Write a protein that holds these residues in place. Structure first.
Motif, PDB file in Angstrom:
ATOM      1  N   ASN C  36       0.784  -1.218   0.000  1.00 49.86           N
ATOM      2  CA  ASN C  36       0.000   0.000   0.000  1.00 49.86           C
ATOM      3  C   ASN C  36       0.838   1.301   0.000  1.00 49.86           C
ATOM      4  OD1 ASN C  36      -2.625  -1.146   0.100  1.00 49.86           O
ATOM      5  ND2 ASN C  36      -2.220  -1.771   2.198  1.00 49.86           N
ATOM      6  N   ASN C  39       0.382   4.414  -2.423  1.00 50.22           N
ATOM      7  CA  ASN C  39      -0.902   5.088  -2.351  1.00 50.22           C
ATOM      8  C   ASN C  39      -0.824   6.243  -1.385  1.00 50.22           C
ATOM      9  OD1 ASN C  39      -3.889   5.151  -3.012  1.00 50.22           O
ATOM     10  ND2 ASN C  39      -3.743   5.373  -0.789  1.00 50.22           N
ATOM     11  N   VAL C  40      -0.092   6.021  -0.319  1.00 50.65           N
ATOM     12  CA  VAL C  40      -0.093   6.990   0.737  1.00 50.65           C
ATOM     13  C   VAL C  40       0.637   8.235   0.300  1.00 50.65           C
ATOM     14  CG1 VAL C  40       0.962   7.438   2.907  1.00 50.65           C
ATOM     15  CG2 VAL C  40      -0.765   5.365   2.545  1.00 50.65           C
ATOM     16  N   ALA C 110      -6.237   4.606   5.888  1.00 50.79           N
ATOM     17  CA  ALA C 110      -5.233   3.933   5.081  1.00 50.79           C
ATOM     18  C   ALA C 110      -5.556   2.442   4.878  1.00 50.79           C
ATOM     19  CB  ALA C 110      -3.839   4.115   5.662  1.00 50.79           C
ATOM     20  N   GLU C 111      -5.060   1.981   3.726  1.00 50.36           N
ATOM     21  CA  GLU C 111      -5.023   0.614   3.235  1.00 50.36           C
ATOM     22  C   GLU C 111      -6.387   0.145   2.717  1.00 50.36           C
ATOM     23  OE1 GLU C 111      -2.846  -1.710   6.374  1.00 50.36           O
ATOM     24  OE2 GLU C 111      -1.285  -1.522   4.858  1.00 50.36           O
ATOM     25  N   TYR C 118     -10.178   9.997  -1.090  1.00 49.37           N
ATOM     26  CA  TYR C 118      -9.326  10.979  -0.438  1.00 49.37           C
ATOM     27  C   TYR C 118      -9.559  12.350  -1.082  1.00 49.37           C
ATOM     28  CZ  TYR C 118      -6.243   7.285   1.461  1.00 49.37           C
ATOM     29  OH  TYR C 118      -5.755   6.215   2.178  1.00 49.37           O
ATOM     30  N   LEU C 394      -3.183  -1.554  -2.732  1.00 48.33           N
ATOM     31  CA  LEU C 394      -3.503  -0.419  -3.570  1.00 48.33           C
ATOM     32  C   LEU C 394      -2.379  -0.148  -4.576  1.00 48.33           C
ATOM     33  CD1 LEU C 394      -5.640  -0.499  -1.202  1.00 48.33           C
ATOM     34  CD2 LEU C 394      -5.655   1.942  -1.385  1.00 48.33           C
TER      35      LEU C 394
HETATM   36 CL   LIG Z   1      -3.681   3.520   1.670  1.00 47.95          CL
END
Ligand SMILES: [Cl-]
Ligand SMILES: [Cl-]
Ligand SMILES: [Cl-]
Lengths: 400, 400, 400
Positions: C36, C39-40, C110-111, C118, C394
């Protein structure tokens, strides 16, 4: 004493410029594969130290010393003492600029350039290309000097607030020469129009790096302002808008076209927006900052795709960000900047022409000469790593 | 009010010092194996908070309070209010120094010291060793005080601009005691003269960390200046040259001798150069900054190799960087510094002797006493992790 | 000109606020699994650019413009020029605050939140929730204005020095709405009272991130001070103590109860301490800063455990840190702050009541309205990723 506030400002701005070094390290290292991760780090610190040593020893002299023939400056070697109470702060800030320009070069050639190649290209940049172009554009722009003479481009009216051309375009042209000469990564392009993506293994570090670059850019622009007045804060706002519209525009493109690994493009968008406003942060409105930055973002996205079509492998997109953003910013100054910042006898057309002459001069000198010298060097001292080292990775293959 | 500019300067410099904490975290965490990655992070934040609490509660009092017998200060506990309008900024900056010194200790013992061991060593550093040596060297050097009395070393003429001895050597001596007592990592050394390298798993983070340390060092030196005048910018230039010549010299060594994992040594070179100029940034020329920094780089490289020959396992090279760099810087002050910064009745020989007495005093107190106490502690509360925990890694083995 | 020092201060403080963005990126990315990780990063940069664009285009107008009915401001759109020589610096700083509040939201979900989710939540935050609550609490607090009118909460006496409620609580309430609506990660909770830990894969980055947040917080508080006087340095000391006692208290808890992965809790302790002193850094003593921060640390630890008991999955502990810390700080102001900072006709009980009315108003508007709108959005445009995408991550599943 009055001179204290401006000195403290410059020193803090120089500190912010140095965080861009951290930012470049993260940005590049996250865009490369783990097997190459250590190389990028060694090169970034090594490149910095070399550049600093050169700039201190003679690069500052060549760039800002009293002009012998107008080509090159000829005093200020081993910079130490001055009677100008702003000169030492200025020297430090300008040293950080030189280091910035050279660092920029190195991200394009990642994953297949030999270490000693980075060092030799850095020497060329710091010793000759950056300080000489620097002299021509900014030779007279010595903080607190009474006695200074303008470089020849500067004298014709060439404007570049913080180095869209001087720093960013110079780095980008040299990066373009490097990638053309060492060639694409193994596995990047195939046969006719085949393009394989090679993705970094630590892309969160590239976002960290983007934010560190963005932060450093405030110092980069703010330390170039030459003084303090009540319009300094407008340079900051324009920096913020440039970067954010660069990213925002790419985000719009990217949602629309459903880009895979969109993170690479939005991040580059932000950097391209920042590069574009570097020429004009002091002379444009907030709306024009958004506009210039936003267009730069879009240009960076399309330039990325174009380079792939040309089978040129620029790993972190130095050329789309720094060169295309820097050219765009330098020309955009003529289009958008308040005309009071021009020569009295210059119209927007006259300003366009001298901005263009600057762009072209930069290309000829910073692409043309490095292209020829690096091609020569490469015939007798190959700059590309061996296929084995590329495949196994520079970490094991090169650094044991 | 006049006192505003200097306060704002100190506060910003304190901010830069705090980024050195980020820098240490990255530098160490990248030099360790993934199975140990979390431990280093927990210890760095934990060590910081403990040190801050101690310094606020009583360490500042012991170090800078009015001197009872000359051993130790005895006022300023739970620091809050003052009639000195520079004292609060100063307290914060000095708190960040204490945290720096203690943080330094922890990178040597990585991959086999129990967590509660870091905490107890940190307590010793922050409660006793750092503030007491601090008092002796810097007890009278309270920003804006009218009423201050010099520590006994300070009174004899001992000079240390920003803590080559006070911060760096104290940390390094305590680190040396720690590594001798807990012993080398499993698999580091074998039988006679066998030396296996153990390489970190995130070395790009160590370059990030090197740049963050370098940036923070500008604040470290700049916030120690005690005032503002037109020579402040020369402290910055000398900081930049120290670090860059430290790295550049190691780069020269390393290209020549073809060092494997050269990244570790160049990065340490930069840090050693910065440590060495910490004693004298305000009192030397730019050429001498380059010289002192460059020699420090070389010393760090040779000290690294020497420690391996002695079968001492200092994971990030705290002792080569901070201790050898700090000793070198403290002595070098006598050799290079403009004599106007000395006592009127001191020659260079007299200054050499008092710098040496400071070096030796520091070793006896910051190595000798910790060595004895930590050896005692270890007999009843073993500081090394179990072999199982070392092998599996502190992440799973210790932190589940 | 007098106005220079304060402008330069604000600009530098704004720079420090921007480093909190880097800090959030690191903090979150290290608390998530490698699958993931990208993505962050994409969300953090994307969220920033969107928020900046909104705040510039109209959010500043809604928050700080002349009040039409008292609900919302109605001038300052596309912020550019002013006759107030402090307004541009202020706008930039306030833009960074808006970006802070929105960034805070994103770490809870998250995740398993889709990317476009978002973005849409960020739009809601930046367009409506933050600027409107902002107007009510801080509408009159325009640096250097002659002409300003207080928001209705502000007028009743609501105090919030740097945004324990305005920034931190608003983000936290919106984060709570988001996690309740998208639900827990697969594998987090089972059947009755089963709780599985899901640990991040790059926890050293979370310590880097904690230090970057801590550094940025000095700017966050320092840039809110509204002026310079000789008490500014006390805001810095109180910031340092808040954070360090937050962590130190959790360290005490954690040693005692032998917490597994204690690093997560101590780090969150530091952030909770910083959040709590954000309401009152200018109006409390050093002892009270330690006290408020320390209690906030403890609250964060117990709130973390409570949320798990409620089967609410807040990945980085946004709600324990920002919301519980922010509520605690806002109320604590009434308990500890020197009464001279209150309305003349307010006792501590009166101040408690208006602080509470602010807390409750914030909850109703920043939890209640987002909860309803996001629930509506989710019925027609599911915000949770598909099970396949959550399982594969993700990175591959969403970003190819
Ligand atoms: Cl995420
Ligand atoms: Cl590479
Ligand atoms: Cl460890």
């Amino acid at each position: 004493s009055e001179s204290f506030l401006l000195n403290l400002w410059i020193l803090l701005c120089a500190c912010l410029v140095l965080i861009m070094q951290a930012g470049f390290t993260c940005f590049e290292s996250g865009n490369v594969r783990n097997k190459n991760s250590v190389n990028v780090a060694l090169k970034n610190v090594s490149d910095f130290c070399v550049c600093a040593v050169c700039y201190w020893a003679f690069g500052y002299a060549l760039m800002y010393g009293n002009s012998i023939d107008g080509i090159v400056g000829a005093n200020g070697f081993f910079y130490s003492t001055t009677t100008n109470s702003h000169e030492t702060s200025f020297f430090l800030f300008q040293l950080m600029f030189c280091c910035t320009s050279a660092t920029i070069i190195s991200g394009a050639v990642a994953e297949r350039m030999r270490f000693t190649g980075y060092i030799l290209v850095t020497l060329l940049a710091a010793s000759l290309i950056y300080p000489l172009f620097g002299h021509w554009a900014w030779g007279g722009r010595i903080l607190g000097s009474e006695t200074s003479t303008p470089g020849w481009l500067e004298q014709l009216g060439f404007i570049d607030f913080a180095g869209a051309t001087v720093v960013h375009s110079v780095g980008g042209w040299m990066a373009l020469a490097c990638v053309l000469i060492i060639g694409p990564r193994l596995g990047r392009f195939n046969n006719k129009h085949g393009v394989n993506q090679i993705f970094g293994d630590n892309l969160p570090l590239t976002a960290l790096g983007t934010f560190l670059l963005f932060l450093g850019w405030f110092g980069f622009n703010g330390g170039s302002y030459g003084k303090i007045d009540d319009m300094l804060s407008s340079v900051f706002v324009n920096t913020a808008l440039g970067g954010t519209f660069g990213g925002f525009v790419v985000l719009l493109i990217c949602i629309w076209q459903q880009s895979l690994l969109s993170i690479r493009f939005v991040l580059n968008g932000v950097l391209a927006g920042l590069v574009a406003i570097t020429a004009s942060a002091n002379s444009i409105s907030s709306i024009d900052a958004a506009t210039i930055g936003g267009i730069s973002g879009a240009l960076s996205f399309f330039a990325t795709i174009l380079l792939e079509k040309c089978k040129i492998d620029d790993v972190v997109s130095v050329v789309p960000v720094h060169l295309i953003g820097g050219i765009w910013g330098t020309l955009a100054l003529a289009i958008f900047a308040d005309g009071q910042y021009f020569i009295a006898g210059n119209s927007r057309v006259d300003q366009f022409l001298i901005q263009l002459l600057g762009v072209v001069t930069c290309g000829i000198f910073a692409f043309g000469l490095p292209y020829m010298l690096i091609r020569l060097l490469n015939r007798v001292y190959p700059l590309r790593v061996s296929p084995r080292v590329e495949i196994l990775g520079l970490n094991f293959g090169e650094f044991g």
